[model samples]
Target chain A: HTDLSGKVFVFPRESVTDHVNLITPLEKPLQNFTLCFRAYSDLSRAYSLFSYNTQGRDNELLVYKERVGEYSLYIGRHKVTSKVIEKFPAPVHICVSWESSSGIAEFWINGTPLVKKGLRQGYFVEAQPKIVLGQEQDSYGGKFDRSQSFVGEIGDLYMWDSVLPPENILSAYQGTPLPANILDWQALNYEIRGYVIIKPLVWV
Target chain B: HTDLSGKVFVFPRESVTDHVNLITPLEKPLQNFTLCFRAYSDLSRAYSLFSYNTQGRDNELLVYKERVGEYSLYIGRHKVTSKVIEKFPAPVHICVSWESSSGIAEFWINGTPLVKKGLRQGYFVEAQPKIVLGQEQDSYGGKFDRSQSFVGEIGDLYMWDSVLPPENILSAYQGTPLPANILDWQALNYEIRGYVIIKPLVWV
Candidate 1:
């Protein structure tokens, strides 16, 4: 386990066994949350950007790249997708937030918000979060799928127990991250399972 | 009541009471369905394109234009949105299909499909469908909200009990409409509730 600040995890190849397991500090169910990360890739196919699996439910929270310029975000196992026209060679800063009170969810890409949609109101995300990067899990903490494996550089990750506001999201996008309640990029407890590399941040 | 063929409903001004009621032939609960319509609008604000309200639910099935180039589709009270870059002055042909078995829903805009998403698998849309155009229903049949009222020309609508395949969707987009199980544009029995005009389909 290491703190991967100022560095990125480079998944150079698609492999079922290669992944980064984030040791989550989530001991209780979450009523609302925010997740932020930067991903760089030009893959035009479907890939798992981030996978958070729990027991009995594989896709508890998942960020899936459905195709170029499109992504599917799964919250409480319900799928919500948004389209983003890509700018070549630029790293994408993605921030997703959901609240149980209104079931409202939003995706902020590069400091701009997409259409807000609602689902799973009053639903709590159960605990036992097994956060995995680079590969999706069919089971809890294991059974990675090669076809859904990510081949990209992912960095500057943060997770909060409470949803971040627009100003905070903009701050994060501008390289001034707010204090994270759950996971912080500057102080991460992550385990590399297979052939993932820690490379210096390369701006495109 | 009239058969509004080769014509469009012109919602000249947005008002709470200005709307059209479609006498839907949806006698049974639907497990799957497809809906297609042609719409012309230049509004930048949010408006309800179609509202299918039932008891206890304001948005059983809804087509809401969230903003310019973005729309939210509601199925079984769950909202899904898609974005389309606008080509000004052209009528937009929109087709939406949903299957209950997989909970997969897709939107086709001008013969191109957006990202498919899933929600409410195995759920059936209850009967007693009260469909309204030009205004959104906050209650069962009345209680229209003026802010959510539509101001545009909408026509050539069809609804089927089953999801249409890609080829059928293409045919419908190409002006060759398939048989509609529920509502057909050429054989409509609709009641004008307020200031809605049946105007000839004008091309831009």
Candidate 2:
């Protein structure tokens, strides 16, 4: 149990092999879940935020930044894009949640929830998935591309096995820790490969 | 029935007498209601959006813009303010709803809903209220001040005697007509005094 709560994975440059492999104690597949993290990047190109891949599906659950003020989410090989019409500042606190029963996907920037969008319905995520940051996975665990690599600082990553309520989501954004069932930033089991550096969280 | 759907009440300048008097069919006191309107203003100072004054109370229900990106709502003489953290554009389609039973208030900009706040629980609005636009009423139906006059274009005004649901709010923002029990833009009963003008809606 390592507490990396005050630390951030700083990806200084973009490279094909630069990434941090995230290991979660999630043994069973999830029908409802939420992923939240704080990220800072000055790049205007497309990059991957969170990539979860199974044995056959590379984009089973993925969060990708298409461009400035635009993002995409993938579920069961299906994708939905959401655009931020407001002024999006740097160092964003983002939360993405989904449910298999209704496929209702929620996207939150900072503390305000955006318009609700639908994703893949009645789809359950596979167990024992490979989750990575700073790069997108074209295969199960490997095959990263330099063009889609993220050059930014990512920290405060947490995942819950169930969809959080509105109050819980606001608490997460306000720097309050919730019961993270799958992955916790305070006590995390992760491995860094290539040029990714683990540094103390710094303000910009 | 006069359909004022394509027209707008353009308050070109800030003046004490530049106001519009709205006549609603509402006669009984209300416990819950929602106000929706479209306004475009370039003033950076404080101004009034909607003012409802009764015989005894001057601030029964009011919508005042304290500054840019900030707004306030009055219910039963109690005030609550909300700030917009994002880049709020001009010509905003705003919706403010309040329920006296729960004291829950909702503020919507464009089409996104902000964080809900509470104000004036267990308060019923008095009957025979006077509603005005472009100026705040210091006294009931009179005593307009020059500093709080609004200089902008306002249109698509509608009010319902009940707090609208999320779907209905979205419909109002999308230029779709709903059952506006109090006031309807399609058949508005309004009288403009001073320098106020009625013209077709023009984009900035």
Candidate 3:
């Protein structure tokens, strides 16, 4: 379990049980930017991107689950009534962007748009603690259940303080277009002023 | 068309066209360390190791035309017979030691003894030209009309004025084994010795 602010992250396929979380702080929080990465697997587990407030409330932006040799990306917090944005085979590249102001969310795979939807206030306030890469901590962020972690490689993660256009997100993932401002943690000297607390003991 | 006396040599995949000559001057004629690098196309062509005297006469040390694979090694010109002491795939590694006084030659590949042969009383004089990498000119060194030249990547070539032991040759290839004493060119410095030359111009 980690806290994500205004920073970009990259994760290579070192383990299958890896995950991250995006959390909104009690005071200020992050709003937008596209989340992108490449995944290669034939398993049916869920790869999630959701926002959690300090009170432990979730507003999922995207959830990818394998089904019948294909993967489907879903949007919205209505787990019971969420709709599928796109479906494709394994070894895929995905990018998703969420705009809290317009309650609109979009999904792209391999630089192609697959789905878009509108909601009512898609995000919670800064008072909520957001978790970035992995799943929800049912017991106050103590231990991560195995079934809730992400499996596969994830690279070139980015976060914006505001909503990003669809074309810009697509170009960023393809490496053809650079962001107006980058917050890459993998860089030698990250531009954003923050510290990433990596707990090696909790990592398997 | 370069002279081969004390110079390190390379036979890249492209320069090969049927047969070529690797001749050494007679004054500094090789008495020991007749090293060769060979790359083939799936073990289909025939190859041989030969040495030529200043009199334009050539003698065969080892001949391996039936086997279809890449190999590298050393051979002695004492006993004029076709005997393959060592055979390696793709990137071949070899070291040989020959002394004209006793007419003795030893061959090793990656630290293992492949063959040890004794030559006749006809010592290889200083005036004898050495064919380092390819075959002799005019005789077996004909165009691709009869046989195909070697096809592969070759690197890290070295030669010693004195014979190196099997352990030394193996260590040199493994980059861990040191020689009793380095002679002309150190195996570690093959790349910087200005001896690497790839030939042939076949565009596909």
Candidate 3 residue-pair clash tally: 30
DockQ of each: 0.03, 0.03, 0.02
Task: List, residue by residue over A1-204, the lDDT tens digit for candidate 3.
Answer: 222222223231223234454433225554555555544332355544333433444443335443433334332343212234343223455666556677566667677766466553555434434344544343333244455444333345554555667677677666543443323323322221111112111000
What are the runs in model 1 whose C-alpha is more than 4 Å off?
Answer: B1-204
Model 3 Cα displacement at A97 (Å)? 1.9
For each candidate in the order shown, give its overall lDDT on alpha carbons.
Answer: 0.82, 0.83, 0.40
What residue runs in model 3 are displaced by over 4 Å at the alpha carbon?
A: A1-33, A49-53, A59-62, A66-76, A79-90, A121-128, A134-136, A139-143, A176-204, B1-204
**Positional deviation of B146 in candidate 1, in angstroms?**
20
Q: Which parts of model 2 have CA positions greater than 4 angstroms off?
A: A85-89, B1-204
In candidate 3 the C-alpha lDDT for residue A202 amounts to 9
**Candidate order (lDDT):** 2, 1, 3
- Show the colliding residue pairs in model 2: B4-B186
Fraction of native contacts (fnat) of each candidate? 0.00, 0.00, 0.00
**On DockQ, who's better, 1 or 3?**
1
The best candidate by lDDT is: 2
C-alpha lDDT (0 to 100) for residue A130 of candidate 3: 38
